[PDB]
Amino acid sequence: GPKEWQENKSWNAHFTEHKSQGVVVLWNENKQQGFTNNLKRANQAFLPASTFKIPNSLIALDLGVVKDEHQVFKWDGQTRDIATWNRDHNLITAMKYSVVPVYQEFARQIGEARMSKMLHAFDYGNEDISGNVDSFWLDGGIRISATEQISFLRKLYHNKLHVSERSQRIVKQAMLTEANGDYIIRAKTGYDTKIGWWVGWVELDDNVWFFAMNMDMPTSDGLGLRQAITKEVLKQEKIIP
Amino acid sequence: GPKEWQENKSWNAHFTEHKSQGVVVLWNENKQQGFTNNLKRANQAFLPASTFKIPNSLIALDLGVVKDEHQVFKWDGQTRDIATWNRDHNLITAMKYSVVPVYQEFARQIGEARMSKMLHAFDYGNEDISGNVDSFWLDGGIRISATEQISFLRKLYHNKLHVSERSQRIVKQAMLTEANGDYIIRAKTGYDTKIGWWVGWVELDDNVWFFAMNMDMPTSDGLGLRQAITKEVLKQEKIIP
Ligand SMILES: [Cl-]
Structure with a gap:
């Protein structure tokens, strides 16, 4: 039967498009199921x-x-x-x-x-x-x-x-970051000179999708990739248009 | 001394552009000053x-x-x-x-x-x-x-x-309606088949602008003018880009 966590490696294309490395983790609250391109990195603290x-x-x-x-x-x-x-x-x-x-x-x-x-x-x-x-x-x-971030965010x-x-x-x-007639994003960025984070959730009319991503960030020039890569995943999954 | 309330009739151009009639009322919270294109209608119930x-x-x-x-x-x-x-x-x-x-x-x-x-x-x-x-x-x-709407919204x-x-x-x-890196709008539309309303506020980093507008609304075809006209006033006053 179905698993709590599934791996979708097709999201790797969104990292390799930018010659970058990282993980996106999504949690579908209605279905009580999670998805990630890299289960190992999803659990790396x-x-x-x-x-x-x-x-x-x-x-x-x-x-x-x-x-x-x-x-x-x-x-x-x-x-x-x-x-x-x-x-x-x-x-x-x-x-x-x-x-x-x-x-x-x-x-x-x-x-x-x-x-x-x-x-x-x-x-x-x-x-x-x-x-x-x-x-x-x-x-x-x-x-x-990243999965611990999801757990914390779900409690919040x-x-x-x-x-x-x-x-x-x-x-x-x-935490409010963006809102329109299609979705609301509540989230927080982070950067430690080595990795970048974006964690939060997307509220829809009839569901919530929690997310946590981190990626290698050797310089600050790539900080906008945190949101851009996450949004490419959200778009691919039809969560946002 | 300075005026608590000032009339700016140049905003009428945004109503006449659509062959419409109405009032927009703005309140600058930091300055404790209000602005409207029509002082009489701003205070009509x-x-x-x-x-x-x-x-x-x-x-x-x-x-x-x-x-x-x-x-x-x-x-x-x-x-x-x-x-x-x-x-x-x-x-x-x-x-x-x-x-x-x-x-x-x-x-x-x-x-x-x-x-x-x-x-x-x-x-x-x-x-x-x-x-x-x-x-x-x-x-x-x-x-x-509209001015009573502002007073109510300020209390809220x-x-x-x-x-x-x-x-x-x-x-x-x-009430959350729109949000981005420039502003947050919390608001509520209204429509009674005769008049259209939009009331709420715009949150900026260092100030909040309350607004209340109503306009003659003979047909539902023009409902989007409630936000469109208000946003033209907000843009004219450099509140939103
Ligand atoms: Cl909110």
Whole structure:
């Protein structure tokens, strides 16, 4: 009979088209079935990089470190290399522009003891916060696979994580990336200088498709391939037009 | 001193371009200033038509008539003229397709006493539910102006209405219409066979512009002008590209 996970290697064409290597993982919520071009890489655990902004946001909201999605976190006045980081931000814009320094301040306020306890409650990856509490997701010991990202995102979608419903609703709002009459995408990018991520889901009228992709990213010039390759898979599968 | 409200008649060109007549009202939240092509019509009261799906959804959620945005309202099996109504719906899709029969059922469950009490608590328009409990917003006594729509929507945006924060967040989610890297639109269309409405807001990185427009709508052929004319005003004012 049918399997929980199927391999579709035809999606490899979308990686080889760009001389790139990686994995796309899809989960059809109605059918309770998953699909990927590479089951082994789908289960390989990597640093989450800025995809960690999802759980970090949830913890900061639930503890009151972030009061709501409108609270302003003033620029600290240090000019950094990414121009969009050199301004005031709220939770919405800090997630949109992947503003590391804002989330580093959240993490310090959360603190190591509460961060570790909450990642255990979330069943998040290897739950390991070794390194600094304000950088472990960029250069520390935490590791999560694409299928683990799907599992976490499905709990978030269903308000099943061990934080308040309010915190989960706010973070799902902050994840909003694209919407039109055909679909809604809620997602988060990540990049660690070695691999790039895009994780999230596509809401349709009568189904949800969760996705998690990562790919080798030797330079930042290819960052747009995260979304472009994912969308080629979504188009091939008739999920988006 | 500066003016809270200013008239810009140059926007009339966008109405005359289509041989149409109406009003667009904009509110700049950061500046606390409003703009319209027609101050008189901005403050005249009309049937809300399907824009009433905003308060109707809030009331149904807060009273528990609708449990959440996933609860399914099964099609009653009556084939209606609008094909998208002839299927099962949830709150998200019922708002997207303006599914009148679903909201008529909500209104009957809410009932006259609680509907009247909640519109009073909302300061919604003339607060008058005279007519049929399941059609007064289409052919009964309720009336609201475009400026009153803005005031109501501002309260919703700030979670200041007299229902739970949860109900307000769910309805704001259901209002999602369009999103990209430049803006997010949360809005609701309306149409009563005589007047057309579009009301909602545009979220930018550092500001939000509320809008409410209505226009004479003698035929359904021109329904797309509600968004088209509004977007021409938004583009003229450099709110969207
Ligand atoms: Cl949303």
